[PDB]
Amino acid sequence: HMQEQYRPEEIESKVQLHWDEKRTFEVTEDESKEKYYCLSMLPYPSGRLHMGHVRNYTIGDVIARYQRMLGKNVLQPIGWDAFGLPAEGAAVKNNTAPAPWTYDNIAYMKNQLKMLGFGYDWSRELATCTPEYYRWEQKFFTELYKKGLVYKKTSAVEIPQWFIKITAYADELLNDLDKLDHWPDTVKTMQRNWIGRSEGVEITFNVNDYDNTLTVYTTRPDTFMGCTYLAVAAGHPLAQKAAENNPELAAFIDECRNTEKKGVDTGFKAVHPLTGEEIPVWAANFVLMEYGTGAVMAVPGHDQRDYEFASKYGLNIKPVILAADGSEPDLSQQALTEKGVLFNSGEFNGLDHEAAFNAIADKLTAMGVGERKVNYRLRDWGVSRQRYWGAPIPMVTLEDGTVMPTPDDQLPVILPEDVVMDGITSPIKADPEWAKTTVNGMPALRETDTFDTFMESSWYYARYTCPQYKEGMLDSEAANYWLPVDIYIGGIEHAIMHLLYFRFFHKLMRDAGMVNSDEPAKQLLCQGMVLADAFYYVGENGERNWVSPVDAIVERDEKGRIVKAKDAAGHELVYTGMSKMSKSKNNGIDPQVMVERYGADTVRLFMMFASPADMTLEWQESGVEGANRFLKRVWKLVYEHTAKGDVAALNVDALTENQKALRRDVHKTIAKVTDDIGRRQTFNTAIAAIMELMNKLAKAPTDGEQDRALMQEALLAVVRMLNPFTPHICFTLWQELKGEGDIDNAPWPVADEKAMVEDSTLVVVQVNGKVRAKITVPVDATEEQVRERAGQEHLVAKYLDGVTVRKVIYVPGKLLNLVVG
RNA sequence: GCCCGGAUGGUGGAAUCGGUAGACACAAGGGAUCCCUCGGCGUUCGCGCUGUGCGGGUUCAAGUCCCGCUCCGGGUACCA
Ligand SMILES: [Mg+2]
Ligand SMILES: [Mg+2]
């Protein structure tokens, strides 16, 4: 019989074994079913799950289990972003090498994920550090090279690097943000600003005693009459020409290479092409040599950086834009930034921003000293690292100096895993023999740098669709069946790195014919951070010592606010509130400890209950114990119910009004929970609705056969509704209730419309807008019947005593407001 | 600087379409693991006044819609 006591330790590993043995969450490309691809950002194998992993993957798993119960064919994959820096650190610190360390972390973390009962298709599990994964990005990289999308260049970080031409897709990456209605605006705005398409004008100046011109780039050509000096990047040819005869500038250039406004007068004078005036050219620290032309016309009255530099160096500050209210601006403190009507600008006075922009661009073009120009903040993607633990770059240099891709017959370029790290140099660099190779029987040197680990995370989501496919990077039929990802769950912190790279890589894959869609993921859900209480004491040395909130001993006033805290050693603690988890504040909570203390189901439930998915969640032991206690109550109710044996069939027509009202609450809950999980994604309020119903069901009668049949229906519905959140307990309870088959394949409950119909309705009676009663009336009562009933309420009548009803507002079956005077 | 979120009890937060504010849970307390009570003030226990950051507006009716303000949280920029 059913155990009386709920014991996660006797239930969770058994259900988990069942899921592995039956391969419950393994899926194929079944065209007779509607697909749903639920994806969570894959973990780095650091060694132990953190609470953010737990939140992220619980959200994914709730969604994946729900969509299955709706009858979809659901892919939920997991894997390991396994290359990267931290393994080198650890290898050196320990007796070891990056690979064994990494494989150990995977085993450990994998067992943690299974202990949490995330329903992954384990047969699609990938580790990005294996040659079976990385060979394909090696081959893809050679293809990109052949398409003209990859090149070598020396650059600052200064060293040679391999670049992929992400700028060749800048406009698509920008325009397609408008297809991403189910991405958060914050993420979209971050990518927009990162790409930074800029519409401006290049303007060329003649410079005295300089046998060249100087070209600047501006987005505010409308301010050109306020240009009081030019500034050039430290690395600009003009600055380097002047430094020939200028120690000060020479010194300044050198400092900038290494490295608050700073500059050196170049001594050169440029001629403003419209005013004829001579203006000074400075070399300045705020001017990036790599963007636009490496030079700007400075307009200190209207650019804040130009303002600060001009004040510091005594340069003229000229106003040429009116304030919003039409008034000449106050530039005594700072730049007037806003676009406005021109003054102090000759023939352009009175023009607004757009008119002035175009009039001045037009003029300078006609004069042949300017032209419209679009620039982009986006730079090409440097994918080269001088680091051991990553996929080797499949390029080779022939003795004659020809750089070319590694022949297809030498892919993959295997990174050797059995190495000894000396801590300062890559083993594949330190050994001069590794780079030696042959290409067409001519000696060749193979590349020794490895890929940026963003390389692996940029396409893993697609490889999951066909992870054992050996004929290519993607099996396109499989990929096009699963893709695009339906929901991608992970942090907002990846907004302009990975979240941009994976869109870009998707498009590269489409354009290699490998997929037939434009965007990799339809919905992006960024889960909020998990916070914990933070405490510290000040030692006798004046140093703050942070004390884990587990170890804090708190005391509270009679309304429960923390008023004093100590640690065991008796130090006085300062409470800093809820903060981001961190080693430095020492407030990290170990998910493994809570799983072992309360069971996975308690942890999962708490995490989904405590806060909306996209808001920060405040971890509280209090809350977790609450969720645990709720599970015991569910267990208890089902224990009591099943003790009493089978149930007769529910007779829906013969139910009492109290029975009808409970049954209506069951089905209204089904509908609210369905809407909340599936449309609104408010998982907290879904769980709240289940708790609310469970409270009612614990108070319902359970003697009569009808009461028991009603309870059976309710419990079969509650357990299914709980299942995506707490599936171990729900799997087991489902059997105890004698539900049909495994709960993982049971259909999501659907609300019975007949069960939800009401025989009465509550009407809120107001008098001049103030609630004076709430009356229950027949569901189809007429407005005059409702009125009559409201006047019979003494609570209302006593506000109708000796006053006149001027009018009435009535919302059928909801509200009657009697307006009186 | 600009991009957001947000501001409702002692706490975390609900309120979807303007119409019973505070669901659900924690902390309380205090009763016999279950039952109840729980925004404030008063209460004849039926309710009355008051109440969603501040100030106005719209409306029979505002947490919800518009107009200011004050305060908070988190991103993010020498890209001209
Ligand atoms: Mg010249
Ligand atoms: Mg408050």
The residue type of A774 is K
- List Cβ neighbours of A225 (8 Å cut-off, separation of 6 or more): A274, A275, A318, A320, A342, A344, A345, A346, A348
Which residues have a Cβ under 8 Å from the Cβ of A405 and sit 6 or more positions away?
A141, A142, A145, A146, A394, A395, A396
- Residue A369 C-alpha to ligand 1 middle, in angstroms? 14
Does residue A636 sit in helix, strand or coil? Answer: helix
Class of domain A532-586: mainly beta
Residue type for A329, please? P
Find the Å distance, CA of residue A284 to C1' of nucleotide B8.
52
Residue type, A163: F
Question: Any idea where the domains of chain A sit in the sequence?
Answer: 1-32+587-759, 33-196+376-531, 197-375, 532-586, 760-821
Q: Which nucleotide is nearest to A694 (CA to C1')?
A: B24
Distance in angstroms: CA A569, C1' B8: 40
For chain A, the residue count is: 821
Among A550, A230, A168, smallest CA distance to A376 is for A168
Phi and psi angles of residue A741, each rounded to the nearest 5 degrees, phi first: 75, -175
DSSP string, A665-682: HHHHHHHHHHHHHHTS--
Resolution (A): 2.1
- Residue appearing with tokens 């804090």: A552
Work out the end-to-end distance of chain A between its first and last CA atoms, rounded to an integer number of angstroms. 69
* Residue type, position A542, single letter: G
For the segment 564-603 of chain A, residues whose CB is within 7 A of strand B:
580
Q: How many CB atoms lie within 10 A of CB A818?
A: 23
Å from CA of A270 to ligand 1 middle: 9
* Superfamily, domain A1-32+587-759: Isoleucyl-tRNA Synthetase; Domain 1 (1.10.730.10)
Which residues have CB under 8 Å from A21's CB, separation 6+?
none
Spatial separation of the C-alpha atoms in residues A349 and A342, rounded to whole Å? 5
In the block, residue with structure tokens 């709430």: A774
Helices (H), A545-656: 591-598, 600-609, 621-643
Alpha-carbon gap, residue A32 to A39, rounded angstroms:
22
CA→C1' distance for A369 and B7 (Å): 54
Spanning CA of A521 to C1' of B15, the rounded length in angstroms is: 32
What's the farthest any 2 CA atoms get from each other in chain A? Answer: 111
Tell me the nt nearest to A675, Cα to C1'.
B16
CA distance linking residue A763 with residue A779, whole number of Å: 10
Would you call the peptide bond into A591 cis, given omega within 30 degrees of 0 as the criterion?
Answer: no
Q: Tokens for A22?
A: 């039956």
Q: How far lies A291's CA from each of A198, A304, A307, A445, A506, in Å?
A: 11, 18, 20, 34, 27
- Cα–Cα distance between A755 and A164 in angstroms, integer? 61
Long-range contacts of A736-741 (CB under 8 A, 24+ apart): A736/A2, A736/A638, A736/A639, A736/A642, A737/A638, A737/A641, A737/A642, A737/A712, A738/A646
Distances from the Cα of A372 to the Cαs of A138, A220, A225, A377, in angstroms? 40, 11, 17, 17
* Alpha-carbon dihedral sign for residues A660, A662, A666, A671: positive
Distance of alpha carbon A821 from alpha carbon A815, whole angstroms? 20
What tokens does A154 get?
Answer: 């020396």
**Measured distance CA(A633)–CA(A614) in Å, rounded:** 29
Cα–ligand 2 centroid distance for A561 (angstroms): 14
- CATH class given for the domain over A33-196+376-531: alpha beta
- Contact predicate A53/A607, CB 8 Å: no
The residue behind tokens 């027509």 is A653
- How remote is the CA of residue A226 from the centroid of ligand 1, in Å? 23
> What is the CA A791 to C1' B39 distance in angstroms?
31
Nearest-angstrom CA–CA distance, A776 and A164: 70
State in Å: Cα A374 to ligand 1 middle.
27
Compute, in angstroms, the gap from residue A262 CA to the centroid of ligand 1.
26
Residue with nearest Cα to nucleotide B76 C1': A190
Concatenate the DSSP letters of all residues of A78-112 into one string. -EE---STHHHHHHHHTTS-HHHHHHHHHHHHHHH
Query: Is residue A336 classed as helix, strand or coil in its secondary structure?
Result: coil
CA proximity to A287, closest of A226, A196, A217, A213: A217
- Measured between alpha carbons, how far is A483 from A511 in angstroms, rounded to an integer? 15
Q: Calculate the CA dihedral of residues A300, A228, A196, A352 and round it to 10 degrees.
A: 80
Q: Which DSSP string corresponds to A115-161?
A: HTT----GGG-EETTSHHHHHHHHHHHHHHHHTT-EEEEEE---EEE
Partners of A716 in the β-ladder: none
CB A284 within 8 A of CB A263: yes
- Distance in Å from B22's C1' to A688's CA comes to 14
Phi, psi at residue A342, to the nearest 5°?
Answer: -80, 145
Helical H runs in A314-445? 353-366, 427-430
Check residues 626 to 655 of chain A and report those whose beta carbon is under 7 Å from nucleic acid strand B: 626, 629-630, 632-633, 636
Spatial separation of the C-alpha atoms in residues A476 and A495, rounded to whole Å: 27
User: A312 phi and psi, to 5 degrees?
Assistant: -55, -35
Quote the CA–CA distance of A630 and A613 in Å, as a whole number. 21
Fold of A760-821: Ubiquitin-like (UB roll) (3.10.20)
- The CATH architecture to which A197-375 belongs is Alpha-Beta Complex (3.90)
Report how far residue A651's alpha carbon sits from residue A710's, in angstroms, rounded to the nearest whole number. Answer: 9
Please state the residue numbers annotated as binding site of A for ATP.
583
Residue listed under structure tokens 């893993």: A460
CA atoms of A44 and A570, how far apart (whole Å): 39
- Asked if strand B contacts A523 at the CB level, meaning under 7 A, the answer is no
Amino acid in the structure at residue A79: G
Check if residue A776 sits with its Cβ under 7 angstroms from strand B.
no
Cα(A471) to centroid(ligand 2), Å:
61
Q: How many CB atoms lie within 10 A of CB A441?
A: 6
CA-to-CA distance for A344 and A227, rounded, in angstroms?
Answer: 12
Query: For the residues of A43-85, what is the DSSP string, one character each?
Result: PP--SS--HHHHHHHHHHHHHHHHHHHTT-EEE---EE---ST
Are the beta carbons of A347 and A337 closer than 8 angstroms?
no
- Is A689 in contact with A676 (CB distance < 8 Å)? yes
Q: List the A533 CA – B7 C1' distance (angstroms).
A: 21
Amino acid at the residue A67: Q
**Number of the ligand closest to the Cα of A281:** 1
Which residue matches tokens 């676009």?
A339
CA distance A366 to A354: 18
Q: What is the H or E stretch that residue A762 is in?
A: strand A760-767
CA of A814 to C1' of B3 (A): 41
Strand B nucleotides in reach of protein CB atoms, 7 A cut-off: 1, 3-5, 10-16, 19-21, 23-29, 33-36, 46-49, 60-62, 75-76, 78-80
Gaps in chain A (C to N distance exceeding 2.5 A) after: 157, 259
Which of A9-15's residues contact partners 24+ apart within 8 Å by CB, and which partners?
A: A9/A599, A11/A599, A11/A728, A11/A729, A11/A732, A12/A115, A12/A117, A12/A599, A12/A600, A12/A601, A12/A728, A13/A115, A15/A117, A15/A727, A15/A728, A15/A731, A15/A732
Tell me the DSSP string of A402-430: -EEEPPGGG-S-PPP-S----SSS-HHHH
For strand B, which residues in window 331-360 of chain A come within 7 Å by CB? 337
Q: Cβ within 7 Å of strand B: which of A 257-296? A: 260-262, 285-296
